[PDB]
Amino acid sequence: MASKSGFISSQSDRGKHYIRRTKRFSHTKSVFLHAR
Amino acid sequence: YGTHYLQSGSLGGEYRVLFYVDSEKLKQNDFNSVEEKKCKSSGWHKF
């Protein structure tokens, strides 16, 4: 977000930044071997 | 001694194979992206 006013003189500014990041990873491996 | 005796027959060997392969593979990507912007500017004509 950004906001401005400008106009004797007056200047006003507001800024905001937000970031959220998520990484989730899962790996599953299974081996069953039987010989008889 | 069982129930019967062999009156006649044949001798030799027997061989058998059953063999079975089953592969399944799945790969799946689902990607969504929304990008939005709104911005505005105003002033009489001074401001």
Curated annotation (Swiss-Prot), chain A:
Q: What does this protein do?
A: Component of the membrane attack complex (MAC), a multiprotein complex activated by the complement cascade, which inserts into a target cell membrane and forms a pore, leading to target cell membrane rupture and cell lysis. The MAC is initiated by proteolytic cleavage of C5 into complement C5b in response to the classical, alternative, lectin and GZMK complement pathways. The complement pathways consist in a cascade of proteins that leads to phagocytosis and breakdown of pathogens and signaling that strengthens the adaptive immune system.
Q: Which disease is it linked to?
A: Complement component 8 deficiency, 2: A rare defect of the complement classical pathway associated with susceptibility to severe recurrent infections, predominantly by Neisseria gonorrhoeae or Neisseria meningitidis.
Cellular localisation: Secreted; Target cell membrane
Family membership, please give it. Answer: Belongs to the complement C6/C7/C8/C9 family.
Which named protein is this? Complement component C8 beta chain
Please specify the portion of the entire protein covered by the chain, as first and last position out of its full length: 248 to 296 of 591
Q: Could you tell me which species this protein originates from?
A: Homo sapiens (Human)
User: Mind telling me how this protein is modified after translation?
Assistant: N-glycosylated; contains one or two bound glycans. Not O-glycosylated.
Coiled coil regions in record: none
Query: What is its quaternary makeup?
Result: Heterotrimer of 3 chains: alpha (C8A), beta (C8B) and gamma (C8G); the alpha and gamma chains are disulfide bonded. Component of the membrane attack complex (MAC), composed of complement C5b, C6, C7, C8A, C8B, C8G and multiple copies of the pore-forming subunit C9.
UniProtKB/Swiss-Prot annotation, chain B:
Protein family per UniProt: Belongs to the complement C6/C7/C8/C9 family.
> What is the protein's given name?
Complement component C7
Q: What is the recorded post-translational modification? A: C-, N- and O-glycosylated. O-glycosylated with core 1 or possibly core 8 glycans.
The source's superkingdom equals Eukaryota
How is the quaternary structure described?
Monomer or dimer; as a C5b-7 complex it can also form multimeric rosettes. Component of the membrane attack complex (MAC), composed of complement C5b, C6, C7, C8A, C8B, C8G and multiple copies of the pore-forming subunit C9.
The task this protein performs is described as: Component of the membrane attack complex (MAC), a multiprotein complex activated by the complement cascade, which inserts into a target cell membrane and forms a pore, leading to target cell membrane rupture and cell lysis. The MAC is initiated by proteolytic cleavage of C5 into complement C5b in response to the classical, alternative, lectin and GZMK complement pathways. The complement pathways consist in a cascade of proteins that leads to phagocytosis and breakdown of pathogens and signaling that strengthens the adaptive immune system. C7 serves as a membrane anchor.
Noted disease association is: Complement component 7 deficiency: A rare defect of the complement classical pathway associated with susceptibility to severe recurrent infections, predominantly by Neisseria gonorrhoeae or Neisseria meningitidis.
Entry's localization field:
Secreted; Target cell membrane
Full-sequence portion shown in this chain = 299 to 348 of 843
